[PDB]
């Protein structure tokens, strides 16, 4: 590559792996969004929350792809595995599964940042800090806030409805 | 002091004491605000209410400081003791603690006003009446209103959530 | 904590300590501001400079508190010790004391950043870099600029007046 | 008087006396203003400051007169004695004489307020608090601020000029 500089083979491959995690996460959120749009679930505010997250994760993958090219690395795509469940249970179950998901992405970002420091790749460390580390921390705080309110509310059906109407 | 007139040593020292009470109250409200911002408490409306009160109390202390200088008294600062609790319990517990706090400030204002009358210091009596006595009475009525609604609502988790969403 | 990830007990406690340093600094600036508002000091431009810094330091503490909660750490408040002096001498003395203060905050930020690197906590390193490290360097340069001009001007009374009127 | 109620003969006469003090003060400020407008004094900013104060004192007397009529008291005018000096010396001398003047008005207001309390005349106490007590305290603080700056500046001619140009 004519532009490639200070960009290790190891970081390049981890970037490709992170891109797959983000697309998988996006797919997961798409499944969660449509589940809450079912006529027998019907929680529009929950459906919207997850559909907005699917788009965010897709945007995250696209930013990683752009960065890959900017550094002279080569994007390599793999199969995207289907989401973990076909049915997501209650709003609470789903929000727990979402937080579990986000923590997995966060850890992958932390490991990638650790790889970058190990490889003396300040550009990668900066890129992660700029569009990912804080957005992930803020997203995780919000989900934790939601889990707490959802838990405070479980007369379970009444609580689930109120949360969707008044918070979402 | 070239400007000092009709400003007793006793009122000056009580003004300094009141300034410390107001800063302490502000610190208390800051602790209450951040407690309700915890991911395991997550009552944004309650967090906002207390954070707004912290700023008000800080503004109250600053007005007293300005007045101290206007009269030719000398501001003297003391340590600010930490708030009474590290964790504030429920919205109800916190609002009870807040009302207890406000009543203490109110009594201090009443005592200071009584000192001013005893010392024939009409300017001090006027200053207290203008920015403090009524604001305190109105604030205390509002908290009492809130305590009543919070109490009416305790299915405790559902009530606490509804109060924060619909009143705060 | 349900959200806590990669957030060490050591960083959490240092964050609480830094929050206390910032509130103390704010208190210090409040005392400096009101001292220059005394009828026997009467340097409005100096009073304004310090009062603006008190608010900045308070905002700094509040940002640290928010971050603490975002990471799932627990805010713990301590007594706020009173400022080092009751009277601040000349504009020069005060600006020297301010620079000494800022350097102490800066060093605390540097130590906290070093702790974060030692703990592999990129989010903390990023947060410090974003709202604190540069703001502190720029503030310290400005004070150094002011000290130099104040020193160039000391006919001491005439210089102090001119600085307050033409620079502040 | 058909409207007179709770308005003692003693307060009525003190109101007439205060009206004379305020007109005298106004006359004093007029003399100070024109002295600084002399071609051999020529401090326009000082001339403006005093001319603005003459108008304020005249407005103060007029408010007392209106109040006198509102209460059913009878305005009685006396000779207005000429100002204490024909020539006012330096800006410093003049500002010292002004502060001495204002303190005399303030004390007269305090005594009148004390008479009103002694006579159980809440309307008079309120009227004094509303347009006079605080305005007087704020005016006296400003003069004290000016005296301090003027004193800091005395190369006397250079200081006097700078004060008039940069503060007034």
């Amino acid at each position: 590559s004519q532009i490639r500089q200070n960009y290790s083979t190891e970081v390049e491959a981890a970037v490709n792996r992170l891109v797959n995690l983000y697309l998988r996460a996006s797919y997961t959120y798409l499944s969660l969004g449509f589940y809450f749009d079912r006529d027998d679930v019907a929680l529009e505010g929950v459906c919207h929350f997850f559909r907005e997250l699917a788009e965010e994760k897709r945007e995250g993958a696209e930013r990683l792809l752009k960065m890959q090219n900017q550094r002279g690395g080569r994007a390599l795509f793999q199969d995207l595995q289907k989401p973990s469940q076909d049915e997501w249970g209650t709003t609470l179950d789903a929000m727990k599964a979402a937080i579990v998901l986000e923590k997995s992405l966060n850890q992958a970002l932390l490991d990638l940042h650790a790889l970058g420091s190990a490889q003396a790749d300040p550009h990668l460390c900066d890129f992660l800090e700029s569009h990912f580390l804080d957005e992930e921390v803020k997203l995780i705080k919000k989900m934790g806030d939601h889990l707490t309110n959802i838990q405070r509310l479980v007369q379970a059906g009444l609580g689930e409805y109120l949360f969707e109407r008044l918070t979402l």
Side-chain angles (χ1 to χ4, degrees), chain A residues 69-116:
Chain A
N69 275 166
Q70 285 180 136
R71 295 294 302 275
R74 287 304 161 248
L76 287 177
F77 297 99
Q78 305 304 152
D79 292 335
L80 287 191
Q81 87 192 227
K82 76 192 209 181
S84 76
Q85 295 168 224
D86 290 328
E87 284 198 353
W88 303 91
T90 66
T91 298
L92 174 61
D93 290 327
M95 186 75 60
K96 298 187 153 225
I99 208 147
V100 163
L101 177 49
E102 293 302 326
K103 283 165 132 212
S104 81
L105 291 178
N106 195 218
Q107 194 50 62
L109 297 160
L110 292 180
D111 290 347
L112 174 51
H113 188 284
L115 171 65

Side-chain angles (χ1 to χ4, degrees), chain A residues 14-125:
Chain A
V15 167
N16 283 330
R17 187 212 180 232
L18 196 59
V19 161
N20 184 268
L21 275 50
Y22 267 78
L23 295 184
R24 268 169 70 195
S26 184
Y27 200 16
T28 288
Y29 288 128
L30 177 76
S31 181
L32 273 151
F34 284 99
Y35 164 78
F36 286 98
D37 175 63
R38 284 213 217 166
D39 78 274
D40 60 359
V41 180
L43 294 167
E44 177 186 345
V46 179
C47 171
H48 201 75
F49 176 80
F50 291 127
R51 282 212 56 193
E52 280 299 312
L53 285 168
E55 155 179 6
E56 282 174 34
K57 289 320 194 203
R58 195 225 339 127
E59 274 153 22
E62 292 171 0
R63 284 186 201 100
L64 288 160
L65 287 170
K66 174 175 171 174
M67 179 274 288
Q68 182 75 293
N69 275 166
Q70 285 180 136
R71 295 294 302 275
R74 287 304 161 248
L76 287 177
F77 297 99
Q78 305 304 152
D79 292 335
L80 287 191
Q81 87 192 227
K82 76 192 209 181
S84 76
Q85 295 168 224
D86 290 328
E87 284 198 353
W88 303 91
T90 66
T91 298
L92 174 61
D93 290 327
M95 186 75 60
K96 298 187 153 225
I99 208 147
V100 163
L101 177 49
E102 293 302 326
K103 283 165 132 212
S104 81
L105 291 178
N106 195 218
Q107 194 50 62
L109 297 160
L110 292 180
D111 290 347
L112 174 51
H113 188 284
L115 171 65
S117 306
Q119 240 119 209
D121 193 334
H123 175 92
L124 173 85
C125 295

Side-chain angles (χ1 to χ4, degrees), chain A residues 43 45-46 49 91-92 95 142-154 156-168:
Chain A
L43 294 167
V46 179
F49 176 80
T91 298
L92 174 61
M95 186 75 60
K142 184 192 224 218
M143 283 177 179
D145 285 355
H146 286 342
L147 271 177
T148 288
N149 277 284
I150 288 158
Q151 294 161 326
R152 172 183 286 127
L153 284 164
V154 318
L158 166 72
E160 191 164 16
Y161 176 77
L162 282 171
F163 183 77
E164 182 269 335
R165 288 283 95 180
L166 306 175
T167 296
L168 308 170

